[PDB]
Amino acid sequence: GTEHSGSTVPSILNRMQTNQTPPTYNKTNKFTHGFQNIVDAYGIGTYRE
Amino acid sequence: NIIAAKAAEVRANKVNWQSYLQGQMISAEDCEFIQRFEMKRSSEDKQEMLQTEGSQCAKTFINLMTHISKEQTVQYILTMVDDMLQENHQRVSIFFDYAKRSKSTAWPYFLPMLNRQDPFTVHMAARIIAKLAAWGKELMEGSDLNYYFNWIKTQLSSQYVQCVAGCLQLMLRVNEYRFAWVEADGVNCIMGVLSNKCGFQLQYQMIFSIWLLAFSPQMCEHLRRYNIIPVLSDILQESVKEKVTRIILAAFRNFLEKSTERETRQEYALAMIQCKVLKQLENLEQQKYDDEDISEDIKFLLEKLGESVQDLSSFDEYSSELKSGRLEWSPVHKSEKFWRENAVRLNEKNYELLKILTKLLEVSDDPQVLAVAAHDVGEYVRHYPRGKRVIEQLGGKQLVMNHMHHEDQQVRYNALLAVQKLMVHN
Amino acid sequence: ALSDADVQKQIKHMMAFIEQEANEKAEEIDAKAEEEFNIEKGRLVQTQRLKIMEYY
Amino acid sequence: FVNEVRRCEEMDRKLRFVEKEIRKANIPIMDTGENPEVPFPRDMIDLEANFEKIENELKEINTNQEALKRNFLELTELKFILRKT
User: Fold this and answer.
1) Angle between helices B385-394 and B396-403 (to 10 degrees)
2) Where on the chain is Phosphothreonine found, per UniProt (chain A)?
3) Which of A21, B108, B158, B360 has its CA 20 to 30 A from that of B233?
């Protein structure tokens, strides 16, 4: 993105850790998405469960 | 940052001057000055520099840049002396290093110099040039800095080019040499290099140069022959760097403020017809900034462009151009005030203008003027049933029907619109 | 390094940007002072020229 | 920045009007594909202004051809009454 627009931007993406609770994600595919939806319809739990 | 990198490199090098403090090999009496009052941070050192009176400073340093020639030593020595010459907000200020004994201490050493253009030679040259504008010495002759290669080589290439451009925009402040340069071919070089699509910083500096040159109304009349204002408006449309738009707007405001003579300021109308700047102000007005100068300049330009359209919009010149035989898409076509109130003026003696416009539609075959005439006649009949029955009698309805079969389809659609304006209860 | 190198890059670009903008504001305000120099010098010069030509 | 967002809402309104107009007239859409065809300029503003102008043109043609149809109906009524000895 900097190469397209050379606005003298080094495009720095640092990292941080705080008290905020992270979101939860699980990659699905062609024969597992409806099952993720079944679990989500009845509730989603903690993080890294 | 190549020249900035060179400055950084030589900013960590203090030369070996004590080893030859009295030495004739390097800086016999200059090293005495380097020893004495080296701490420029101290105001006492700067103000007791006057004890020297320039006898060593900038008098024995004259031709010292030429005394040394090895690329790895001359550069450190030259950058040290130049860096001492650089800041000088109160050290030298208005050329305090006079040293009246010789005028060779200021202008006439550049001639052997400016050769081997790369290692801080043209750069310290541009710095010595920077000791001319707001300093206690003016350039002895314009050809010294108006007919040499230190800018011809930077016309196209390269941080040195950017540094030269920066110094150049800095030097356009005193009319004495601004006028001498620009009256020569410097205008052509500036126009050529701004038109060449390059780094935005360069063109940005050149529009500063244009804004500075706009300070003279006579110079604006001189430069009217170039198409600078619409092309800068095109750049404004195709480049939005905040500051760049600010400077283009500032140049237009300065031109509008000077106003050498209205009869020569057709640029009021050019700022619209060539590019509808008000279209861009429909959105720049939505853009908000903290700099109140942006808003003030925007309001100034907006009001003045509105009054430019007001003065450009006149039934007098309108009928004059309708009788001239050459027509264009004047903004008055969409001026609903015209077609609402001043439309009865198109009825001259026994509808003379309507008659000759019907004849122009009959004879002419240029699609632009034909479409203009058809659109104008349609907007005329949009407000007059008397004109409607007259044009029905004339048979010009059939002429617009023939224009609905014109070779160009846009003119066919315009004729269709005109007939639709002839369709009210018909 | 990558963390502190990026910190250095951020600080560099920040100081460069503000140096640009602030120096440019200073230059513009100085130019305004110069145009106003022209205004004052014109006013005073003409007001003096009146008396000069009267006397002569 | 709600000025730009409101502008976008106007763009959506105009495009929805075009959609209904084509659907009444039975004009299909190609709809091939090529989903990632996405620039981000400022010229799109002027583009959709031009499109809004064309939409105003079509609106004017509608509001005029309705009157033309009314006039034609009255004139055909005149033609009808002109058949009587």
Assistant:
1) 80
2) 21
3) B158
Distance CA B294, CA B181 (A): 31
Burial of D17 (0-12, 13-18, 19+ CB in 10 A): middle
Distance of CA B281 to the CA centre of its chain: 20
Contact C13 A8 (CB under 8 A): yes
- Residues of chain A with Cβ-Cβ distance to C6 below 8 Å are 10, 12, 14
Helix (H, G, I), strand (E, B) or coil at B106: coil
Both tokens of residue D42? 């400022």
Residue C43, min C-alpha distance to chain B (Å): 17
Which partners does chain B have (≥3 C-beta pairs < 8 Å)? Answer: C, D
Q: What 3-state class would DSSP assign to B200? A: helix
What are the two backbone dihedrals, phi and then psi, of residue D77, each rounded to the nearest 5 degrees? -65, -40
Does any CB of chain C come closer than 8 Å to the CB of residue B133?
no
What is the distance in angstroms between the Cα of A8 and the nearest Cα belonging to chain C? 8
What HEC string does chain C produce? CCHHHHHHHHHHHHHHHHHHHHHHHHHHHHHHHHHHHHHHHHHHHHHHHHHHHHHC
CA angle D15, D17, D19 (to 5 degrees): 70
C34: contact with B, CB 8 A cutoff: yes
Q: Which amino acid is at B187?
A: V
Query: What span, in angstroms and rounded, lies between the C-alpha atoms of B382 and B339?
Result: 8
Which of C13, C27, C30, C39 is the best substitution to test chain B (most B C-beta atoms within 10 A)? C27
| Amino acid letter, residue B288 | K
Compute the distance between CA of residue B259 and CA of residue C45 in angstroms, rounded to an integer: 22
